[PDB]
Amino acid sequence: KQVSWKLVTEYAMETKCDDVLLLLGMYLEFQYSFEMCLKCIKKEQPSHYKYHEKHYANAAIFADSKNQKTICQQAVDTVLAKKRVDSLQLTREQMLTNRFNDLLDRMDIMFGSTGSADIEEWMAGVAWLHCLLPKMDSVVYDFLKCMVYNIPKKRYWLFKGPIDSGKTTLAAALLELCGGKALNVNLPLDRLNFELGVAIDQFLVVFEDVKGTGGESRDLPSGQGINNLDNLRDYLDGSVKVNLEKKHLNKRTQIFPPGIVTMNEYSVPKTLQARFVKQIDFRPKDYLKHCLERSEFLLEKRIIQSGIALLLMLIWYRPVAEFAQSIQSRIVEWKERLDKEFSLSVYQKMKFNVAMGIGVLD
Amino acid sequence: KQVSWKLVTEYAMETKCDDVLLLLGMYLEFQYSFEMCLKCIKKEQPSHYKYHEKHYANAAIFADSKNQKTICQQAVDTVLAKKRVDSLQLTREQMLTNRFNDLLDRMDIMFGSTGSADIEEWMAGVAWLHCLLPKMDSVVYDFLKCMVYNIPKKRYWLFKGPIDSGKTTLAAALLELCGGKALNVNLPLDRLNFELGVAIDQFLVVFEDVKGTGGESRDLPSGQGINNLDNLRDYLDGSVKVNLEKKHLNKRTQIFPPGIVTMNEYSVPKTLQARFVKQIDFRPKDYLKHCLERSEFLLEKRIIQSGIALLLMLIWYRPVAEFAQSIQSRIVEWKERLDKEFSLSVYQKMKFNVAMGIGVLD
Amino acid sequence: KQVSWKLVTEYAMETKCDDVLLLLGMYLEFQYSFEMCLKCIKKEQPSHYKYHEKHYANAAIFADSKNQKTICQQAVDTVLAKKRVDSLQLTREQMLTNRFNDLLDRMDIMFGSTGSADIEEWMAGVAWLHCLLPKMDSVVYDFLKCMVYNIPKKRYWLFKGPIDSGKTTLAAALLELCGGKALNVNLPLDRLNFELGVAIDQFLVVFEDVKGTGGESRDLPSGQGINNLDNLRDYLDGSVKVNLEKKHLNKRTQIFPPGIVTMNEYSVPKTLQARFVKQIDFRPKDYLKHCLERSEFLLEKRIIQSGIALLLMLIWYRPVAEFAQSIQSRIVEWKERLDKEFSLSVYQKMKFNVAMGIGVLD
Amino acid sequence: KQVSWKLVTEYAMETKCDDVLLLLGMYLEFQYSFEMCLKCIKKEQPSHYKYHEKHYANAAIFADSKNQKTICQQAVDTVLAKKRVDSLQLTREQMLTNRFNDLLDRMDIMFGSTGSADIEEWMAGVAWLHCLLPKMDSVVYDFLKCMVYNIPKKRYWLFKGPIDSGKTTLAAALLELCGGKALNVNLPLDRLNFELGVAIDQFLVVFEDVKGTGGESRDLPSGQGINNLDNLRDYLDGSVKVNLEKKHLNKRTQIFPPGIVTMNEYSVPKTLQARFVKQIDFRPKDYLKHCLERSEFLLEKRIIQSGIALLLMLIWYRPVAEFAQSIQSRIVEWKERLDKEFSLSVYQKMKFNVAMGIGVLD
Amino acid sequence: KQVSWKLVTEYAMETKCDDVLLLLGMYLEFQYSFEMCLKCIKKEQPSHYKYHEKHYANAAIFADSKNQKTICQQAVDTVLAKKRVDSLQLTREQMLTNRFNDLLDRMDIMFGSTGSADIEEWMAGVAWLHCLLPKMDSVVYDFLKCMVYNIPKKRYWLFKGPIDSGKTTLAAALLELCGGKALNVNLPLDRLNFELGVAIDQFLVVFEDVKGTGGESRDLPSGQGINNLDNLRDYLDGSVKVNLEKKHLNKRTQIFPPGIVTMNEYSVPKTLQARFVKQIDFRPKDYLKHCLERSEFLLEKRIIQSGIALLLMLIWYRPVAEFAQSIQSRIVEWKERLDKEFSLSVYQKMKFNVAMGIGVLD
DNA sequence: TTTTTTTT
Ligand SMILES: Nc1ncnc2c1ncn2[C@@H]1O[C@H](COP(=O)(O)OP(=O)(O)OP(=O)(O)O)[C@@H](O)[C@H]1O
Ligand SMILES: Nc1ncnc2c1ncn2[C@@H]1O[C@H](COP(=O)(O)OP(=O)(O)OP(=O)(O)O)[C@@H](O)[C@H]1O
Ligand SMILES: Nc1ncnc2c1ncn2[C@@H]1O[C@H](COP(=O)(O)OP(=O)(O)OP(=O)(O)O)[C@@H](O)[C@H]1O
Ligand SMILES: Nc1ncnc2c1ncn2[C@@H]1O[C@H](COP(=O)(O)OP(=O)(O)OP(=O)(O)O)[C@@H](O)[C@H]1O
Ligand SMILES: Nc1ncnc2c1ncn2[C@@H]1O[C@H](COP(=O)(O)OP(=O)(O)O)[C@@H](O)[C@H]1O
C-alpha cells in the first residue's frame, strides 16, 4: 500500500542500529516470506529472527520503494539523536556502567559459541596479578570509586617504582578495563600544547613515565618532562574548566579528566608530591618473574595486560551489592559460571604455584 | 511504460557489480537487439552474454529514462548493503569458503572448453612458487589460518629483504587470493586518513615497501612511513572498533583488518617490531632468475603473481580434509583433474629444470 | 514537444565529447538553420558539419529547455561509462588497435581530398626523427610491445641526456601516439594526490624532467622530484592495485599505467634504477640545429613533436603482419599510398639532406 | 505568463557577462520604465542604455520570479560554454583578430561624441613609447607574431636592466593589447598551485618581477622566484599539456600560455636561460624622465601603461596588409582618421620635445 | 494569502542587509502587532521602528512559511548584486558622494529631536581635531582629492611621530570617513597572503605599525614590517593589477587601493620614500593631553575617533562648491543649522581654549 | 561535504 516510515524507525531503535547501509541491508532481507525463511528456521541472528515476521508485510512494500535510502536516513537520525539526547545527561557512573556492560558482552565471545579462548588460563592470569600487592580486589574498587566521584584534587594516583616494575603492564590493564587514553609529557613545551588536547572528553587518562632531571645518577633518563608536569597544576586539580587544543580546530574548554601517572624512582618536588591521592608502589619480586618463565602463555594470550582480567577479578572477589544496581544481575551469572567451573582449591593451587614461583598450572 | 528498478538491481546483485559507472555502462549495452547481439553471439564477456536476453526489454525503457544515474545508485547500494551485512553476519571462515568458491568458479571457466590458458603453464608457476621457498604451501596454509583467526596483536606478518627478492610478488598472489587491499603510507599523515577509508569492510590488507629511515648509506632514500606506522599502531592491534571514513558518507565503526607487510631493510623501531607475529626473509637467487628469461610467458601472463596459482598449489599439496567441509567436494573434483592431467615425472622434470635455472619445460 | 535526451547522448557518444561545457556549447550551435550555417558551408570542423542537419530540430528545443546542464551531465556520464566498460573488458592490444584506427582517420583528413596538410612536409618530419637515434624504427616497435605487454617491474623507460638533447620531444610524440598524460612530480607532497588523480583510466603516464639533488655541482638546480618519486616505487612496479583520487570523488582502485621518465643527468638510487627496464641516451647534434634553423616548418607545424609522424614512421618501415589483424588492410592501403607518392631514392635524398645539415628539401 | 529565459541568455551573450551577480544585478535594473529611466536619459552606461527598452517587460516578470539565481546560472553557463568551444576551435590568429576588434570598439567609443578622450594626449604617448627603444614598432610586431605562432620552447621573452626602466610599463601595454593576466611567483611553493590556476584558458601571461639570488650583491633583495620558475620548466616549454588547478575544482589539462618575464640583473640557470628566445635590456635615460616630469597627463590618465596606446602606434607605423584580412577595412578607416587629424609635423614636434626632455605638448 | 518575496527583498534593499541570518531574525520580529510593539514604542532602532508597521501583514504570512531561509537567500543575493553592479559602474567621486550621504543621514539621527548626542560636544570634538595638525582642514581636502583621483605611483601617505601622538586616531577617523580596512604587515610572509585578502573591494587601506628592522637603533622594537613591505612595490604604485585572495575563495584581480602607512621613527629606504606623496609629522603636545584630561567626554563617547567629526570639520570650513552637486543642498542645510546654533566667536573660543589645555567646554 | 586551511 505504502511504506510505513514508522516501522522502519522502530527497527532502528529496537536494534540500536545506526548505519544507514546496515539498516538498508538488514531491512531488505525481510522481503521474503518469513513463514519459510531459512534464517528464521536456523535462528542464527536474533536481529533477524526476532523481527522478520512483524516487519515482513512492510518489507515487501519497502522493497519496491524508490526512496529507500532516504527512509533509512531519517530512521538512523532518530537513533543518533537518542544517543545525543542521552549523552547530555549521563552521570559518570552511568558511563562506567556502559563501559563494563559492553566488556561483559565481549566476554561471552571468549568462551561461548565463539569460544575464542579458555576461561581457565584467563583466571590463571587473574591469580597471577593478585599476588603482586595487597588486596588488589579492593584496590580496584577503590580506584573505581575515585573515578566516579571525581572529587576536586582528590583524583590521581602515582605508580612509582623502578624500571621493570610491572607498572606499565598494570597500567595497560587499568586503562584496558576503564577506557581513557595514554599521553606524553616528555616534549618541548613548544610542542606540548596539542598533546594536551588529545584528552578532550576521555573519561580517564594515563600519563607516560616522565624523564626526571638528574635521574641518570639513579640511571634513570632525565630531562624536561618533570619540569613540564608541575607547571600543569590546574589540569590536575579539576578546580575550574580549561581550554584544550585540537589540531586543525578551535579551542574547547572543560573540566580536565581524572586519571593515572607512572614514575621511575626519580626526584619529586613537595608541590608535585602534594597533588596525589596516594603513591602506589611497585618493585621486582622475581619469583613471580620465574613463574612467568613457567607460565609464558599469559604473555602469549596477553592476559597479563588485560583489563578484562581486572573485570574478571572484581566479578570474583567483590560483593554483588558492590556493583551498580542493575548490572549486579549480570555479575551473578558470571559468578554462577565461574564458581562452579572453579573451586577455591583450584584458584588456591594456582596462586600457590605463583607464590612458589612455580608455573601457575604446574 | 516504466523502468523496473527491481530488475536493474537484480542484475547488479548477480554480477556483484558495485560501481555506478560500470553498472550504468554495461546495462546500456542491453538496449540493442539481443537477437543480433555480436557480444552474445561471440560469447565474449559472461557478464554480458548471459544476461542480455533477460534484461533487453527493460534496458530499452532504461535507455529512454531521464533518471538513469539515480537508478544505478539505488542498485549499487543494494550490492554494498549485502556485502556489509555479510561482513558482520558471516564468520571469517565462511567468508573464505565464499571467496574460494568464487575463485573455483573462475578456474572452472579458465580451464574449461574455453580453456584459454594451458594448465601446465599455470602449474609451471606453482613449481616456481613452491621453489621460491621451501614448504611454501605449508607457510601459505599457516598464513591463511592466521588471517582467519585474526586474533588481536597476532595479526601481522613481515616480509623483509632486498630488491627483486620476490616479496612483492608473493604479496600480490596472496592478495589476489584473499581479497584485501594494498595501502600506500609513504605520505603526509594529516592527509592519509582517506587511505584507511579504503580498508572499510575488507578481509585483509597489505602495506608495500614502506620508506623507513636511516642506513640510507646503502642508497636507500629515507622517509616517514615507519613513523606513521608506529604512530598508527593503534589500528594494527585489532583492539576495538574504529570509525573509518569515506567522502560524503557516514563513518564506519569497525575492527581494522589484519594484514601483511613488505620491506627493503630499513631500521625498525623495536616498538614497531613489537607489533608482529612473524618475520620472513627473502633472498635473490640467480637460478630463479635465469629461468625466467626462457619461461618469459609466465611473467607475461602474470601467472606467478596471481592467486589462482596459489589455489592450484594448495589443491596439489594439501589434504582434502585441510579445506572446509563445505568446499571439500570441489577440492576432490579439482584434485581429480590435476591427478588426470599430470605425471609426477612432468612435475619433477620441471622442478628439476627450475633448480637448474634454464629450460624449465625442455 | 519534448527534448530527445537520446539524440544528445548519441551526439556526445559519437563525438566522444566528455566535457559538459564543450557538449553544451557544441550542441547550441545547432539551434540555427543548418542551411545557413557558415561553419557547415565552410566545413570548418567535422564535429559540426557532419551533425548540424541531423541534430537541428532537437537543438531548437534544447535551446528553450530549462534543464540544459542536467541533460548534458547525463550525456557526458554515458561517455564516461563507456570508457570504464572498455577499460575493464578490452585487451590492451585492442586499445592500441582502436587508438591506431583513430589516428588513421585523422590522416584520411589531414592528407585527404583537402590536401589540408602537406604529406611531403609530414613525411619530411619522419626523416628528421629517424636520424634522432640509432635504429629509431626498432626503438619504437620495442616500446609499443613493452607498453602493450605491461609486464610487472618491466614498465618504464628512462630517457637521459643533456639540455636540448631531444628527450622531451620524443616523449611528447610517443604520448600522443598511445594517448596518456604528463605529470609534474616536482611539486610538494600535499598536492600530489590530485596530480596522480589525473592518471585514472589512461594508457600511459609521462614524468617530465624530474629534479634530483646535488647536481648543482654542475648547476643542475636541486629539487624533490627524485625524492618524491622514490615514495612511489609501488606505483611503478604495477604489482598491486593502487588507490587514486579526484576532488569530491571517492578513491578508484586500479593498476597504475606504464610510461616514460625524462631526465637531465642527476644521479639515481638503485631502488629506482631497479624499476626502469631501459635507459636511452640522447646527444646534441649541431647539424640538427642547422637543419631545424633552415627547416622551421617542422617546428611551426609541431611536426617532429607530434605523434602522427611516428605512425607514418612505423608504416614506412614495419612488415604489415606486425600490425594487429584488423587494421592490416588499412595499413596495406596507406603503405601503397606512401610507396606511390614517394620513391625510396627521394627518401634517401631527404636523409642525406639531414645528414648534410642542409635544409631537408632541395 | 512566464519569464523568457531566452531573452536573458541573449542579454548575457550580448554583454558577454560571466558573473552571475553582475548579470543578475544589471538585469534587475531593467524593471523600471526605460521611458523614465534616468540612466537611459543620462545615456551613461552602454550595457544599460542600449538594452533596457528591449528587455523591459521580461525584467518586470523576472522581478516577480521565485527562481532568480537559477535563471542567471543557466545564462552565465552559456556565456562560459561559448568561451570553451572557441578556445578549442579558433586559430590563435582569429583570437588576436577578435581581441583587436573589441579594443577597436572602445577606441570608436572613446574618441566619439562621448568627447571622453583627447587623441592628442594618446598620440603623445605613442611618441614617448616609440622613443623608449630602437625600432619599437618592429619589436611589437615580432612579439605579436611570436604569440600567434607559439613555437614550442621558443616562447618567452626576458626583460632585464635597472629598476625604473619601464619594463613593467611596457609589459602592461602588451598584456592589455592581448588577452592575459599576470602572476607573482616569488610565493611559498605550496600556495603556488592556486597561483598558476589563474592562467587557465588565457592568451598571454606575464611573470612579474621574479627575484633571484646573488643580486643581493647590489642588494637586489633575495627571493626564490628564479628557483620556482625552474621547477615550472615544462610550463615554459609549452611542449605538452600541463595540469592546472583552481580551488574546489578538478584539474583541466592544457597547454600553458606564452609570455614575458621581468627582472632585475639576478643570475639565471642554464635550464631557464635556454627557454627564452629573446632578451631585452632596458636602460635608464634621464631625458625620458625629464620629459615625463613635464608630461604629467600621461600617467594621470594611465596612457603609457595602456594597450590602447600601442594599438594607435601599430596603426601608425605598420602597413595595412599586416593585419588579419578581415579588419583591414576598419584599419584603413582608422588610418584615415589619424592622418586627417595629425600632420607629420605634429608628430615630429612631439618626438622632438620628447628627445629634448621638454613637455611634449607644444 | 501568500508571502510577497518582493516586500522582503524591498526591506533587505531598504536596510542594505546582506547577512541572511541578520535579515531573517529582524523580519520575523514584525509578526507581532507593531501597534503595541515595545521596540516601536521605545524607538530603539530605526531599522526596526521605521518598517514594522508596513511589513506586519507580510511578516504574519512569512512566519507560517515552510520556505523561510530560501526566501532570505534570494533577498541577500539582490543586495550583493547591487554592490557588485556598483563596484564597477561608478566613478570614485560618486562612491565618496554616496558614502557622505550615509554619514549625513546618521548625523540627522544623532542630533535629531530624538537626538541621542550633544551637537555641542561633537563641536568640541571638531575643536580638538582642528588643533591636532598644521592646516588641518586644507590637509583633509587634499587627502580626499588624492584618494578620489587615485593617480598611480602618487597614491600613498606616511604618518610618523612618537608613540601616543595621534597617528592611529587620525587614521581610524579617516578610515571611517571613507570606509576601508586596516592591515598588519609584521609577519612571516606565509600568513601575509591571507592578510591582504582583506583589501578586496575596499576604497582605502591602512598599514598600521610597520616595524623597521633593527629599530633598536632608536631603541624601538625590531620587526620585519619594512622588509616585508618593500617587496610589494607594485601594490603601492598601483599602475597594474594585483592578484588577491581570501580563504576558500578563488582569486580576484584589481588595483590595490590607496591608503596610509604609519610608524614611529624607524629607518626608511629611499626605495620606500619614493612611494609616498606626503609624509605628515605628528608631535605630542601637552596641552592636548591636559585638555583630554579635563574633557574626557571626548574620549569616553569616542568623539575624536569618528569620521563624523572629520565630516563636521569639512562642513564647517569648506566652500559649498567643493562638494558634489548631488549633496550641495544638504551641506547648505547643515551649514545653516550649525551657523544658527554656533557663532564663529564661540568655536573660535574653543580653539583658543584648547590652546590653553583647559577643558574644552567652559 | 569537501575543500581549503592548518600546519611545517
Ligand atoms: N628470489 C628471486 N630471485 C631472483 N629474481 C627474483 C626473485 N624474486 C623476484 N625476482 C625477480 O624480481 C622481480 C621483482 O620481484 P619482487 O617485486 O617480488 O621483489 P621485491 O624484493 O619485493 O622487490 P622490491 O623491494 O624492489 O620491490 C620479479 O619480477 C622477478 O623478475
Ligand atoms: N639531438 C639534438 N641535437 C640538437 N638540437 C636538438 C636535438 N634534439 C632536440 N634539439 C633541439 O632541442 C630543442 C628541445 O628539445 P627537447 O625538449 O626534446 O630536449 P630535452 O633534452 O628533453 O630538453 P630539456 O631537458 O631541457 O627539456 C628542440 O626543440 C630542438 O630545437
Ligand atoms: N628608460 C627609462 N629611463 C628613465 N626613466 C624611465 C625609463 N622607463 C621608465 N622610466 C620611469 O620609470 C617609472 C617606473 O616605470 P616602471 O614601473 O615600468 O619601471 P620598471 O623599472 O619596469 O619597474 P619594476 O622593476 O618595479 O617592474 C616610469 O613611470 C617612468 O617615470
Ligand atoms: N598630539 C597629541 N598630544 C598629546 N596627546 C596626544 C596627542 N595625540 C594623541 N594623544 C594622546 O595619545 C593617546 C593615543 O593616541 P593614538 O592611539 O592615536 O596614538 P599613536 O601614536 O597614533 O599610537 P600607535 O602608534 O601606538 O597606534 C590619545 O588617546 C591621547 O591621550
Ligand atoms: N614481580 C616481578 N619480579 C621481577 N620482575 C618484574 C616483576 N614485575 C615486573 N617485572 C619486570 O618489569 C618488566 C617490564 O614491565 P613493565 O610493566 O614495563 O614495568 P615498568 O612499567 O616498571 O617498566 C617485566 O619485563 C618484568 O621483568
Explain what this protein looks like in three dimensions.
Chains A, B, C, D, E: It is an enzyme of class 5 (isomerase). Chains A, B, C, D, E: Its cofactor is Mg(2+). Chains A, B, C, D, E: This is Large T antigen. Chains A, B, C, D, E: One of its GO terms (molecular function) is double-stranded DNA binding. Chains A, B, C, D, E: Its main location: host cell. This is part of a larger assembly, with 5 copies of chain A (362 residues). With 362 residues, chain A is an alpha/beta fold. In chain A, 54% of the residues lie in helices and 7% in strands. Chain A is built from 19 helices and 7 strands. In chain A, the strands form 2 sheets. Chain A has a 5-stranded parallel beta sheet with strand order 2-3-6-1-7, with helices on one face. In chain A, strands 4-5 form a two-stranded antiparallel sheet. In chain A, strand 2, helix 11 and strand 3 form a beta-alpha-beta unit. The radius of gyration of chain A is 25 Å and the shape is globular. Chain A starts with a helix and ends in a 7-residue tail after the last helix. Chains in contact: A-B, B-C, C-D, D-E. Chains C and D meet through helix 2, helix 10, strand 2 and helix 11 of C and helix 6, helix 12 and helix 13 of D. Chain D binds one DNA strand of 8 nucleotides through loops.
